[PDB]
């Protein structure tokens, strides 16, 4: 048929078309395999499927006809498009629902987080809501995901089951609802050009829209990105040198919630007493003692990967170096300080032995506890006039 | 080529060491991962490519075993070679009308192509020849435990294109799996073999190819892959004697009791096979 | 005949749509054509045929993305050629040129179905009682785990585990009509080798397909 | 979870003994005026450092006998009760053993706290 | 040209002493470790680079022994040199159309480049010369027992730029492995060799480069690295006589009975090598 275009892809050309030989089934000519009003002996499109719903849209704008209809529908209509690493469309106007469906792109909000369905009227109804995310190869568009639900209970999953998970203390001044683009970008090497395509973009987009579990490679991705990064504030302009940022931590928290177990959502629960959480807090206070004793520019050899997965065989030397750092501290009139070693005794108290290994979910708890005990010690909180 | 009179199952255990057994072309080149369980995947066509490669090498083009490899050529050249060998009409593009000529082209393609004879090959062309299914249908191999891949940043001294910032040197990245033990499930239906002449000698070649599948595929990405245990389930009837899923769960691959932590060698894995139905002979000497 | 309900389930499945064939996007559920093809991989003889009356969906519908390097167009010859000898090496480039397609399958996960099916009798029948003998041979094969070939769930990359369900159709995941499935393929016709598509009655618990051999379409 | 006096694992014992030795030394003089620290060579050399640690600890405890301030002979009794389970000082320790050493140190240090381990 | 007709498997034992055998670009410059077990890793490209350096040194860049140098060479310019050396045009952004032309450019890139002929290369860039796998492979070297990387903080009396804070001084850093005995596995496949003409003299050059690999690669960051044992398995045929894992398990590396502390010398280790199968000959004379 005619060509779909204008998606963020390679050639912006048509989909559902055959140009090769190995897509030949029950031999048909070139586009009779997918016959939608082209050969009028049978039409797939109305004579839970996407191009029939498209055709349902292309006759909502008018107060081979099927091909014409749905390909002028994919040729949108203005604002119903977005991109995570591949295009994502949506459409419903049967009651003028005030389209606000977004992947996301102090205390900046327009709705609740999760307390009830939003108080703006004409937003809670039964009219269906469609969301089609289609990805490019070179000129053929894989339907990476497709969703039909009701905005009556689509908002009830996109935030009212999803941003209730990534809610976590804001480390700095930024947005409360972390946008899916920023969330995915903290899992890539450096930027949103190398977002893992299938098992993060499509995977957890489908999770956000669907309420199903996250991919079982979301947490290993954030883990292996925590290891593969290092503090470097001399290369970035936005102020953040942390390796466990607000987004990596929020995302590990959401994974641990919707896959494993309920965990601390707040700045710090010092009554937690779960060995991974406690070891993360201990690592955090060690690095605090280090960075306070010597300004550290601002460089330190990275043991977070080592201590997260093999706590004993690293925490021995980590605690010895922390003793040295508290010594260098107490040598100066910076000790009445001395409550760093006190915190270390307190945390070691609840720990019978340093565990040999830690599972990936235990590592995620380690990262969450580190993030918590890290924001606990900083001095920036609630700065907005 | 007397076809096989028994049908088979097989469970192949192969492990990887500091390598990438299979990359996902959508996840960069990271090892494939089942997003619903976490265990690493290795698609069936991956191991089929490795089987074809082993048969290509170990046979040196010895006829009755030509293996449609990758080379600088096209299928349709040989579709048409068979065509002129049988003197047909070049127009038809589906299954031909007369049965003897289509059967002749299919039987020539199956009598001298081990991969067509074993896995099948689809010969629908402007000059058509038909289809084949072939006995051996393999499936996605999945690790026994969730694998976690490690991004290994590497460096290169030289630069490909002209330099303007020399830094200019680029940083590469090797995705490796520290360890994984992958289990593949296989099925060899005897009647499809009877339709494509898949013989007994072909079956022993298939077993050797499953055993030495990686001894010939070494490279910078794979590291040390190796076939650890190959377990064969042979049914006495040419149809089944016991369900497929019933036999595949006779293979319990657990962690050896002496170990703890993430596995890093096949010594950290104990494999046991239970007793089989009265009409199934389980062969583990491979 | 009496009908028989077979249970078929697996980890992966891909019942490809007709439109989205190059970058595969499976139907939510097993269609009648795939179901009958599963049946004919357990028992089938050119004297009989299989018809499907219902398909019960016993598990959530969950999709997944798996891209594979795949052979592209086996492109028509621009210049005729012939082999130098009868039996010698000939090839197919599967790694150079545009002969590597990388098709992305949007295939299902953890699927579980129960198929209701029966036995008509066509030409080359031989008798009028073939229904009983063949129905009982299939029942024996389903019980004993026997099969002409390992059934798949769509593509042969996904093998189907099959048992004979003689008890009650187990608890499904869908008790109220929260799914309509759109408009699916009924069964590829072979009298004319065309595509009849059926879905005009909603899916409530079990997709209720009409017989492909009596009403090819709502058009007729 | 807290200090376990029945743990009787040698690195744990050494960590506790080191904690109580440095407790005796710090009860001698506040901190002279600075906590003398050679934990490094102690986990490096357990015995070759612990013997002189024990000499200096004997000095500190024998000096603390004149003053009625006590928390002092209890330190000596604890030294006996710890050394009682130990035999043949270890030439070298391992990574997990040094982690256990630090764990036992901080445990015995929490036990001898100014609050006597009633607050967390 | 000629090529080897024996399958070769080798195990090389090298150790470090207060040095950094291989740095991690993502961990600062800390030695590469497996973060879940603590064993130290040495990338295969590292040892390949050391072999390339030894060959560029002992041959001073003679003919047929160029090396794809580390002196900021441009790889596209080398490809273009290949194209002009075969009298073809390099302007195709892909391989030449005539398969003989691509064969010539790749046989040229292999014929006069030891490291391409041996370790293969990817020359599919703005000026495409193709792909080579190359017979010799190596996998990451993994120590025998976990290494403990210690950070040796150092200083320097001088400032590079204009600094106005220097009694005070600038601090530096070093990472040394007090000791690590590393084990590396290798594979020399005769099919790929006969594809690249990797000869016998190339093999003996490679063995010597493996022995004397570290005698000339000294720096302020390596300490004393040394190749202790080199075990080589010559299978009697062009394909294999025994699996690779059967051989790499004949090399048992344990700790000697007397020593108890952390390993600090090669005499703290015992290394035994079993008797190979009837199809393989083991030579430990390197």
Numbering used by the authors:
A (entry chain I): 78 to 124, 160 to 175, 240 to 253, 259 to 286, 329 to 519, 522 to 561, 564 to 612
B (entry chain B), E (entry chain C): 1 to 166, 171 to 290
C (entry chain A): 8 to 227
D (entry chain K): 1 to 31, 34 to 73, 76 to 124
Quoted from the paper:
CRISPR-RNA (clustered, regularly, interspaced, short palindromic repeats-RNA) along with Cas proteins assemble into RNA-guided adaptive immune complexes in prokaryotes. These CRISPR–Cas systems defend bacteria and archaea against the invasion of foreign genetic elements. The type I-C subtype is one of the most prevalent systems found in bacteria. Interestingly, type I-C Cascade only contains three unique Cas proteins in its operon: Cas5c, Cas7, and Cas8c3.
